[PDB]
Design a protein around this nucleic acid. Structure first.
Lengths: 420, 78, 68, 419
DNA sequence: ATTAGGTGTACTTATCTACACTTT
DNA sequence: AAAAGTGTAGATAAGTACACCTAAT
């Protein structure tokens, strides 16, 4: 009923779960309550975090995909028990906090190296070795330890320093690599990403910034992180601005994470101005790159005692490449969710909605769209050998990329003179 | 990197450094704090500005300034 | 008492407290800090004033502020 | 060669004196270096206090009168040995620092009560119980005060009051009236009362560098320095003209002036509060006719946060005594003659201090107008008076009002005077 | 009556929105 | 070819001073 909260090798507090009332309670140690920082802004150090908000914060750390169903089947528990699910993944979660049952540790610790053949069998036959109609997201992936040469699964206090992602859908790896690299080349703050090869199959290796591998011995230092959901105190279900669906009956219901709601967190950041700029660039980057899947759990903040700070971007992909999905922006611009319906007016009323000067949008928007054409060329060369379809795909990728830039660049100057 | 007490000039220099620390240009810092670029230049150089203006940038950049206590005479004197 | 992170009004209230702590009327307090009484009232009331005006009073009353 | 510096019962540092090089060195403990405050502004905590500044600071704690000669003769040392004199008077001095030779204390501590019979025999024949113009003279003693009986405090306990006797006519009455007037006027001033010994009257002044804790044996001290020790000036500089009134030396001012006094405001905790206290001190002394106001008559409390002005003390009207030379010990715009002070001297004076003239007029006018009703009040605070003494206060009263009305006449001209 | 307050002209001065320029 | 820092100029409009005007308890 009580799980200890551990930061690294240190114990920072206690997570209590009362079975009868189906309730959560989080209280902190005295040294930490004074000197530390909470799990989330909505679970304060005095232990006054409401049970409901605590529950949602834990649920926000779990997988939304078949991995969830594989996990519950492995443990053989019900969907409705979170405590057991957390307790299973307790040692490794998003952030630096590991939830440990009292007086239980492996450690032991060591490692378990991997051969490429056992990965390929998990790529080639998802049915034997783990119909969607119309959706958006998500990809298959695994979390792994990366020393620079050979991959292994880290156990115990040792943890995965990278996220290796597999491609079921056409050219997803090439898509995200280009986009993640394009952002970095543009100077944006974004996680370091590399491509890795398994047999004939390619994968995207993403570096975790909430984890740092110390070379020379066995340890991993973690830095705590929270999603925008966990920060806004929103349910995992609210990750999209429309928290139910695209349905016309539900079209008008937005209880979820919006841009205005996202920007409201800047005050909580260490540097509100620095934060608001990273956010607006994130929006503007996702518009120009054609990323409509950017949502609440794709934007995170580091947790520190002085305040929150925006993390480097991650999971940047252009979904406009894929028309087999219906694409609406997960965060609206002036109550307009359609990427193709965005014009000078939408942007103007958007910045006005954020209570921010319009001249600030045009500066970032104009600068990025012009620097992209020269920037795309650079990223393309960082790729390994490509087959014919992939070069044609990237050729298609490039062309419409410039088309979005050139498209936006047309009406942007009019944004100043539009009267809302 | 070192200002023990703050004066009009060091304050301006304090604002300029945190702005640079965030790798933020003068144009964006001015707009986000709700002021003109020219004024932020004036602020950073320590030239006289409205106290509200200093506070606009202050709250905006998340920098807090406080007095010194004591309890003057450190709760002492005999 | 009441401490403070400092804003425009509390700063004005801080000056009033240091002035009253020293048993000083606004007219004499204004003259030593090199300002008019009305301006000193504006400062204490937190009404917008030139940063230079505040610094004259700050330096004058021997009150120091630092970045946390 | 090494004397330890004690604050109260606690040791805050060490005063070293090298006999051979005739030099002083003051170094402090480390806990005190961060959290504490120096002896004076001129004897810093890092131990960089120059030997000369240390020497002058120590000398500034000694008496300038026959008591000096009584001390050196009692110990039988030379005038030129300060070290022996400090270690002797070390336990009780001005301020909270007691200078203790290493490992020597009585204490034990206790007390020595006093009878009225021994003081009266000690009043009447100054020879038995050890001429142009004026400083002092005056008799005085430092004593322990419980509110009833006076005693000599021994060891860690020290005298909490200074009892002052009148050899010269109505000196007690003069200072009591003037000191009381300041308090009545609302000024910050040490508390003074009159006490009677036989037929003779004495002035009992409360020490603000000492606070008696009731209920047990201790006396708590609060450190203070005069304006000399603060400015780093020799005892000789107490007067603005550090030599004399001589016409050849008239033009030499190396001593403490008003501009030098006000300059200390910056080092004070509240520069504005001091500067008014500074000017009120000037203006009060002008209205009351005190020309003897000098460097050792204005002092500051020493704290880690900065200096603070002490309450005023030793306020006396010397204009009462015409057998003495009266010139302002601190000039007003290079004019030392109290009777030659007019709108111009005041105007250029404030201008010299870089302070607005409207401020002098405000303080001067307010105080001078409240005096007439305030002087009457002080007269009632007096004990039983004889006929001759009543005549003294009458003269006192009359010329007091004369200074007020004289200044109050031309004060309106100060604003418009073009220097 | 002395204090906190409010004036009211008149002096000096900043913030705003651009365009223009001195520096990589 | 920028791209950050730094200018200028006219309409706005705000705080400061000053001798002294005056209510507020």
């Amino acid at each position: 009923l009580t799980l200890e909260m551990h930061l690294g090798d240190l114990m920072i507090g206690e997570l209590s779960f009362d079975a009868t009332a189906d309730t959560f309670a989080v209280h902190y140690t005295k040294d930490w309550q004074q000197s530390g920082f909470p799990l989330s802004p909505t679970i304060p150090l005095d232990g006054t975090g409401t049970s409901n908000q605590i529950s949602m914060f834990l649920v926000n750390l779990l997988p939304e995909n078949k991995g969830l169903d594989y996990l519950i089947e492995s443990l053989g528990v019900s969907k409705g028990n979170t405590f057991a699910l957390i307790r299973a993944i307790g040692l490794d979660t998003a952030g630096a906090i590991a939830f440990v049952p009292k007086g239980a540790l492996l450690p032991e610790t060591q490692l378990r190296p991997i051969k490429a053949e056992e990965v390929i069998q998990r790529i080639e036959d998802p049915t034997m070795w783990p119909p969607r109609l119309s959706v958006a997201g998500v990809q298959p992936k695994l979390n792994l330890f990366y020393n620079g040469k050979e991959f292994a699964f880290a156990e115990g206090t040792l943890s995965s320093t990278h996220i290796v992602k597999f491609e079921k859908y056409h050219h997803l790896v090439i898509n995200e690599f280009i986009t993640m690299r394009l952002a970095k080349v543009l100077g944006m703050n974004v996680a370091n990403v590399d491509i890795v090869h398994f047999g004939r199959y390619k994968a995207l290796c993403v570096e975790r910034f909430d984890r740092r591998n110390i070379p020379g011995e066995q340890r991993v230092l973690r830095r705590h992180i929270v999603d925008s959901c966990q920060a806004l105190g929103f349910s995992v279900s609210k990750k999209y601005e429309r928290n139910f669906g695209t349905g016309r009956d539900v079209k008008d219901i937005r209880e979820g994470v919006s841009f205005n709601r996202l920007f409201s967190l800047a005050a909580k950041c260490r540097n509100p101005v620095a934060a608001k700029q990273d956010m607006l660039q994130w929006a503007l980057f996702n518009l120009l790159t054609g990323n409509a899947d950017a949502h609440g759990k794709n934007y995170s903040f580091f947790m520190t005692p002085s305040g929150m700070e925006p993390t480097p971007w991650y999971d940047l992909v252009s979904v406009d490449m894929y028309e087999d999905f219906e694409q609406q922006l997960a965060m609206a611009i002036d109550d307009e969710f359609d990427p193709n319906s965005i014009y000078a007016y939408q942007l103007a009323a958007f910045m006005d909605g954020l209570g921010l000067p319009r001249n600030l949008l045009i500066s970032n928007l104009t600068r990025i769209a012009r620097r992209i054409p020269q920037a795309i060329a650079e990223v393309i060369l960082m790729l390994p050998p490509l087959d014919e379809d992939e070069a044609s795909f990237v050729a298609h990728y490039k062309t419409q990329l410039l088309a979005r830039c050139e498209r936006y660049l047309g009406f942007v100057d009019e944004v100043r003179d539009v009267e809302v | 990197i070192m200002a023990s007490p703050l004066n009009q000039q060091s304050l301006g220099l304090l604002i300029k450094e945190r702005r640079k620390s965030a790798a933020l240009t003068q144009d964006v810092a001015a707009m986000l704090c709700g002021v003109t670029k020219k004024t932020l230049i004036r602020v950073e150089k320590g030239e006289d500005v409205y106290i509200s203006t200093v506070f606009k940038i202050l709250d905006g950049l998340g920098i807090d300034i406080v007095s010194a206590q004591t309890s003057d005479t450190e709760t002492n004197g005999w």
